[PDB]
Structures are given as structure tokens and as C-alpha cells.
Symmetry: C4
Subunit: 295 residues, 4 copies
């Protein structure tokens, strides 16, 4: 009964809008509303401070990476002084306990904290959730990564306000190849399985290959969809651009992040049109089929 | 229980003809009889006025595109004055309401009108059917595109004389990739599903890769099969031809449309031979299997 | 429940021989015994008179093609005068009725006659069987091609001494692509299905890609296996050979037919070894599995 | 119900270690403990005397090949005099009966003897087990190769201390292609099937493509995993190395065997981490899924 993104087709329902433009693609996560149910991967190869500022300035969700952890206290302070959301990443080591205590003492509370660990179903993650909720009670805590309903439950019960689902979701990623474990090759069914157990929002993390996979993630129960590859290789992205005969970034060149986000929004409005609704939640009650040949 | 064209093999029955030439490939749609149960895609990259005249002059069904909508009233008038069928396309916008009223006033009635919309299960399409049937009662109305039995039913009930079935049927088309919705990758099973509900003729639209897929569409309940790629890239087709070392059209060169239609007819006679009959409907009662590896 | 050659693995049983050389690969068809349960395709691109003489001289089964039908009466006479089996092909047209009568009058009786028609489940084939059995009662009659158990039954009941099973068996052959009918992509399961109904020997025709597919055909109930591609492109084969940097025939070059037949025999002895027997029929009672990914 | 390595994903359990370094990857086979549950293929293209000495000196299991059988008595004597395990291969021919008797007479007892035959379910193998156990009772006897639970049972019952499972396990190996028999294309399910019957340790032989397949073999019941390709093409391996623009060995160049074994150990510690344990046996009780598209 297991499948992935490429195996699913959603079934259209009666169209009730006269134009895509009528369809509302917004979503709320905790106390804030955002333009789209998508978020760039919280990695230094995908996001940086300039991209995060663009995103927050235009009401798109972001989560900053923790590659330069010494910069996070200033990052928070600065975003919040421009009236922008501060959304950061933390780990679970002893120095991250101090970091959090530090924040509590300057009375900085980031709107969002993501605990970002490969194998996030652990007491290390559980204790960090409990520590964060003690010292920064107003922070919205996203915990992961997990791959099972028992894990989602345990993390929600520890106090997480959301969980991030995906354990080496790519079909040929390192985790899958080297360990034999994870959601690689069945990420969509894994998401469904985890979502059926969840009382709190889920961020679906990875395995996204097309804009249609965003609608599919919403059907099987995501609130936010975390995306790597589709956001990689924009002019704004980390790295260098390579007439000539067509650019490459570090593998091809996708142009402007802004155009990509607009197209994502348009494609998602089309999805809502086909779902027979006018808003994002309409995607959640469409029927679907599992196709025979998907590759 | 879902599959597509490549997964199906039809099972032969006792041959009762001494020659393919004995097999009748004709079909009727409304008040007219045609040579073959196939029709070119109603798009400007596939059909034009010269091709439509060839087709009507030789008793092949066609449906003209609406890319130059201002030419349709003259097109109708001219075909009908040469004793040829006029088969046109319309949309659902306010100006198409006027267009239809225009026709009613010059007492032009095209034999066939196709309402051609991407997501055709809509009140926009339902109201256009009702408008057409009021002002041009003698016009044979084909409505689409749809992908479900509830849609076929609703459109038939609104007054359509046929429906066109297929929602981004190609395995790697835009609709599938960008929205996650439609019949892409299971077009044959979608056709079967829709056909079981239908009281009126169905035009099966797209996913056709081989001439054998025409017989397969007939088995699972099509009356006409709408074809794009197989008709693309003929000398007569829109675009330009490119010794040398073998032509290309815009991707390869298939030669003469007339030879393609002859071969389609011969291949279809072979299908009837294998079906144990002498006419097209014999294909409808053959057994079939769903193969394991189809790619 | 349908599959093909690539989906099947046969399961080994306790080995009871000390050497492959102990295993007997012979088979009987009618009144004669042959070295191997394989036979080249009866086509002019695969067999000719020199190859047929080699085969008969060494107790391998052959069936000559009918591309030069005027030569068949002399071919029979000449083989039989060298004490060799005469095995020919016939069609079902009125002149083939005369041909047969001709034979009856010179009291030439070929040991084997193959009625070779694409869609062999027909009254044309049934009447030719009955005609042959009237005028040449001692001839062993192989009739085909068929693809169903009802067809095998009808042909056996008409008087055939064997049937040939396969209707466009190749995964990308003409019949499959152009008509949508036949055993293409499920030839092994088709063979099994037909074999369960049969009271007389079956020749399994086509879809053979490896020497292991010969054992597989035997398991699912063949007596002789007709092979095209594996016998194509030998030095002895029709066509022309193309240092240099390695030969081609018309697509690569396989060397000597004799070496190919020796290797086929050795590979088949290995199959019998793995089947836990010492003779060909041991392959018929092994267990098997249907694998998940076969391509 | 049949599958292979590529179809399986193991499901993570709650992580209980603070570091991979906490996880114990050791295994015992008979009277000795080794670093890893892996062993190089006992073939001259993979192992030699220098590699065997490295392995034994560092507490990795090895099994020497028998390509130069005249060297085995000296090999044993020499290893054992350096305080190293002697692990050799034997066949089942009459001269191997003498070889064994020879050993018994110089009172050389190798710690490990592997009876290495393609089709090892045979009385030839059964009698060699019984001969070995009579003349060298202290030798740990591994018998194979087998592919069924009845074979494992018969060999265990004859006196084998372990069995080696795999009959042409590779997807495109000779045995599969030429005979139609064996575990090729379903090696993991074959291992599971055989393991459920076994009272003694199993060595899983072949079909390993990734380090994650080691954990998968452990889940479905291996004690040691025999590996060919992943160990082929190291600087230390048999053959010759080919700036320049990147080395090849005989197909690419993998560098140092020592680095490969370290990485294998690290990857396997990660597997134990994901399995929710601290030792190898934790992998044995994880849940798993069978994915839809695996290629």
C-alpha cells in the first residue's frame, strides 16, 4: 500500500471559479499568515540572509539555516527591528542549551525555532523541545526530522507546535543508499501515514520534483512543504553563475526566485481550480488514483 | 485497478474474413457517417483550413480550431456552400455568446460545435451548452474536456450530444506536471470509467502513441479518437520542413497525411480481423489482458 | 496473473548428476527424435537450404520457409533421397490446395508440414488441415499461429498434430504496435494458458531473448521452441558480413551456428542439473517465482 | 510476495545513542568474533594472500579462494603460526577427499572450511561435509551455495555449521541468463525464505549494491554478508591500475580497501542508530516497507 509522488494523480471536481485569480493559496502556521504553503530548505546551499529578507518582506515563510550559528542572535534582533519574522534553526548539543538561555536573557523570542536533526525521533530532540518551551514560551517550535506516526506523537506530546516529516526522502540520496533506512522512494505515503496520527501541523520535507507535488503533499496532509532542488540554482542562490550558450548556476540556471514563486502560486491556483474549490483546503478532499507505470 | 494504453493487450478471436479488405472501419456521429473513428486535435499546430477541406472532401471527421475566431462565420458559410460539413470550436466567454447569436441571425447552423475548455466540468460549459441548444438547435454539440463519470453525466444532462474525455492525458504534459491533476498516465482506464456512465458518444482525447491505441480506445468505449502527435509533422502540417540526410518537419517528417490515414485504416482493418469480426463494433467485445512490464 | 519470460525465475532442486554431461536434452515430435527442443524461425532471413541440410544431417529439427514455393517439391524429393527429413511450410490459398494435391500424386509425403499464417485461428487454416490429412495422411501437421486455448482446441480437433503458439510475441513488434492485439509482452503466460488446454504438442514461437528462456518455455509446457533473433546474424545466416574492429552480420556477428547450438545444449544441460533431474522433462515440475523488477 | 534489495526500506525507530560511535557492529561466527558482518567473495579476482593477512591481522573475516589449491596446506600452516585464523575453500572431487585426509595427518585443522560449489544442494556436497567432519572435527564448515529452505535443512542436517545462500544472485549474471534458474532478481526474499528455515548461521552471498544492503541482509536474517563488486577495484585488489584524468582499476578505482571497510563500519553504525539500538541485532526487529518504483 506504499507509493510516492510520481504514482499519484488527483481527480478533478466541478470547476466553480471563472478565473484562477479567484483562488486563495494562503496558509497560517501559528500566529502568522503566508502567501504559499511552501518553504525553502533550511540549508546554506539554498537560503541566506538576503533571500530570507526578501521572503519575510513579501509574506513568504522562511527558515534560516544554522551554518554560522554565532550570527543568529544578531539576525533575530535585526529582523524583528525591521518588523520582520525571525525564524531560525537550532541543534541539540550542550552549547545550543546555552544559546537558548542567552536568548531568554536578552528577551529575544524568535517567532519560529526549528530543531533540525537527521534522526529527530530521539530524547535529545525531546529535551531540547522542553528546554525551548521553558525559556522561550512564545516561540513556535518545529521539530524533526521524523518518519513515523509514533515519532510525530512523541514529539507533539513533548511540546512541539509542528513536526517536520522526511528521512532521506530522495530516491538516490545518501541516507537511503548508505543505511537502508528512511522514507526514500515512498515519501508521499510516509507523509500520509504520519499525518493521520498528527494533532499538530506537518511540514513535508523533500522528494518534491514538480509544482504538482505541492498539491499532492497538501492532499495527503501537509501544511507547509519544504523544497530543496526546485529552489536551487537561481541567480539569487548561493554559488556562481556559469550569449555563451545558456547559463548554468551550479547545474543549470532557473533565473529569478521571484518568478519561480509567482509560477508556483499560479500553478497552485490551477490545482485549486481543478479541485472544485476556491481555497487551499479544497485540495484536501479530492479523490485520487495510483497509476501503474509512473517513471 | 488503473492502467493505460501500454498496459493493455487485446486477445484475438476466430478470424472470419478472407481479407482485411472485407472489414468496415466506418463510424456515425450524429447525422453523418465517416471513414474512420479518428479526428485530428482541434489546434492550430495540427489542423488548418486546407487540411479541413481535404478531410471533409473525403468523408473524414474534422474539428477546426478557434485560434482566428473572426474567420469562423465565413468558414462555416464557405464549407456549407461546397456541400461540406462545418465543424468548429467555441469557448465560454461573453463574446462567444454573441458569436452564437450572430450565427442564429444569419441562419448559419454548423453541423458540429465543440466547446473546448481545459477544465470543462463547469457551469461555464453547462450554460454555453444551453445557450447553443437554444439558438442553434440543429447543431451537434461536443462538450469537454472532462475526466469523470459525474462530469460526463452532468454535461449530457445539460444537453451535450457528445463529451470529450481527457485531462492532461500525456505522461509528461504541463497539466500533470504543474497541477498534479488529470488523466495523465491512466488515460485508458479513465476512458473506460467515463464510458461506463455515458448515454451519449465519447471522443477519447489524447495519450495515443500507436495505431493499436485506436482499437484499444474503441474496446474501452470511444466512438471517436482525437489524435495530436501521430498527425503532427506531415508535409501538409503547419510549420516548415527542415538529399540532406532525411527531413524534419518540426521533429522529423512523416510525409503525406493521406498515406498516414490509409495506413491507419489498414491497421484498423487488421484489428477488426483479429477481433473475429467484420466491422468496428467487433473490437468492443474482445477480451483483454493487463501486462506486467509495459515500458 | 499475466507475466513474460523476464519475470520468471525457476527454483533449483537437489542436484543428482555428477556432471552436466549426464543430462539428456533430446525431444520427440511425432515419429522422430531430435537433439534439442529448439527450432529456427521458418523465415528466409533465418533459414535456407544449406542450413536445413546441416540441421537434418545432425538430427536437429528444422522447418523450411515458403518464400520460393516452386522449389518445395524438389526440396522434399532431394532431402528424402539423402535419407533426411523433409519439413516444409504451406499457406491456405487455392494454389496451396493444388500443391498438396500435386504432392499426393507423385506420392511425396513430407515428414512435417507447417501451415504458417499470422492469424491462424480461422476456417482457412481448419480447411487446409482437413485437406492435408485427406491427401497426405502420413504428414505430421503443425498449425498456427494461435494465442488462445479455444484456438488450440479447435485446431487440434480439426486434425492438427501440433499447434504453434504466439501472436506478435515481441515487445515492440509490428502486430502489437499497429493492431493492439496479440501475445506481445505476455508470451510466457500466453503459452502456459494455451498449454493447459492442449492434448497435442505445442511449438512456442518467439519472445525468446536468452538461452534460459528455452527452459522457461519447457516449464510452461512447450515441446519445441521456435527462435528468431538468437539464430540471426551467424556467418551461415542469410545476408553479408560487415581486423577491422569486430564484425557485423546485419547487426553484429555471432560466429558459427554450430557453436551456438552446442552452447544451447550445454546451457540446457545446466538447466536440467538445476532442475534436480537427468532429462528434459525434469524442467516441467520445478517451482518458480514471479519477480518484482524484471527490466 | 517476492522482492529484492532495491524494493526494501527499513523504518526508523527512536534513536537512543548520542553518537554513532556508541554502536557495536561486531559479529561472532563459531568460536571467533569479527569487526563487521561482511566478507569478501572467495574468488581470485577479489582476494589474495596479502589481503587475507591484512584482514586476519585486523579481526575482519575472510575466506581464501582455491584457485591455487596446492598452496592451501602451506597457507594454513603459515597463518596459524602467526596466530591468525586460517579460512580456506574446498570442492567435492576425489582429490579434495585426499586433501582433507592430508590435513588430518599433519594435524592441521583450519578454523574455517568453505565447500564452494555453484549448485551446492547435492549429495556431492553432503558427502564432503560428512568427510570433513570425520577427519577435521574442529573445523567450522560453511556449505553452499543453496537457494531453498529444504536445501539449507538438508545441509545443516548433514553436519554443516553454516550455509551460504545465493544462486546467480545478480540481475544480469550468467546463471540467470543461460539457465533460467536461481535467486537472480529476488535475492533478498530468497534470503528471508531460507533464513526462516535455518537453525544455523547463514552467509548471504551476492546481489549487494550499496552499503545499505548490508543492514537489509541482517534484517532478513544473515549473519555474514559476502560481497563481490563493492570490494572489486581497490589499489590492493588483483589487476592493474589504469593526473591522467582519474584512475581506473579494471573498472574505476576505489582507492584503499582500508578506507572502504571504515566507511562500511560507519554506515553500519548509522543503520544501528536508525534501528533504535546500540548493536547489530537491533537491525533484526525493525519494520520495513516494500516500495512501488525501485529502479
Amino acid at each position: 500500500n506504499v507509493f510516492d509522488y510520481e504514482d499519484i494523480q488527483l481527480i478533478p471536481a466541478k470547476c466553480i471559479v471563472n478565473s484562477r485569480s479567484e483562488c486563495d493559496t494562503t496558509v497560517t502556521l501559528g500566529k502568522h499568515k503566508f502567501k504559499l504553503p511552501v518553504v525553502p530548505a533550511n540549508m546554506q546551499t539554498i537560503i541566506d540572509e538576503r533571500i530570507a529578507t526578501y521572503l519575510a518582506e513579501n509574506n513568504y515563510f522562511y527558515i534560516m539555516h544554522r551554518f554560522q550559528p554565532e550570527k543568529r542572535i544578531s539576525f533575530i534582533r535585526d529582523m524583528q527591528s525591521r518588523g520582520l519574522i525571525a525564524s531560525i534553526s537550532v541543534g541539540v548539543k550542550e552549547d545550543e542549551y546555552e544559546f537558548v538561555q542567552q536568548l531568554a536573557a536578552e528577551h529575544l523570542t524568535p517567532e519560529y525555532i526549528t530543531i533540525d536533526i537527521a534522526h529527530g525521533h530521539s530524547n535529545a530532540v525531546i529535551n531540547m523541545i522542553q528546554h525551548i518551551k521553558k525559556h522561550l514560551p512564545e516561540s513556535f517550535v518545529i521539530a524533526g526530522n521524523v518518519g513515523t506516526p509514533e515519532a510525530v506523537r512523541e514529539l507533539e506530546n513533548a511540546g512541539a507546535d509542528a513536526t517536520k516529516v522526511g528521512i532521506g526522502p530522495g530516491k538516490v540520496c545518501i541516507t537511503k543508499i548508505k543505511t537502508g533506512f528512511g522514507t526514500g522512494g515512498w515519501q508521499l505515503a510516509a507523509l500520509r501515514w504520519c499525518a493521520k496520527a498528527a494533532s499538530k501541523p506537518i511540514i513535508a520535507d523533500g522528494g518534491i520534483r514538480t509544482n504538482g507535488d505541492v498539491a499532492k503533499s497538501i492532499r495527503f496532509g501537509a501544511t507547509m512543504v519544504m523544497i530543496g532542488s526546485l529552489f536551487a540554482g537561481h541567480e539569487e542562490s548561493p554559488g556562481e553563475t556559469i550569449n555563451v550558450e545558456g547559463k548554468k548556476m551550479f547545474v543549470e540556471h532557473k533565473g529569478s526566485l521571484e518568478d519561480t514563486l509567482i509560477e508556483m502560486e499560479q500553478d497552485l491556483q490551477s490545482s485549486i481550480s481543478y479541485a472544485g474549490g476556491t481555497k487551499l483546503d479544497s485540495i484536501r478532499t479530492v479523490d485520487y488514483v495510483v497509476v501503474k507505470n509512473s517513471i
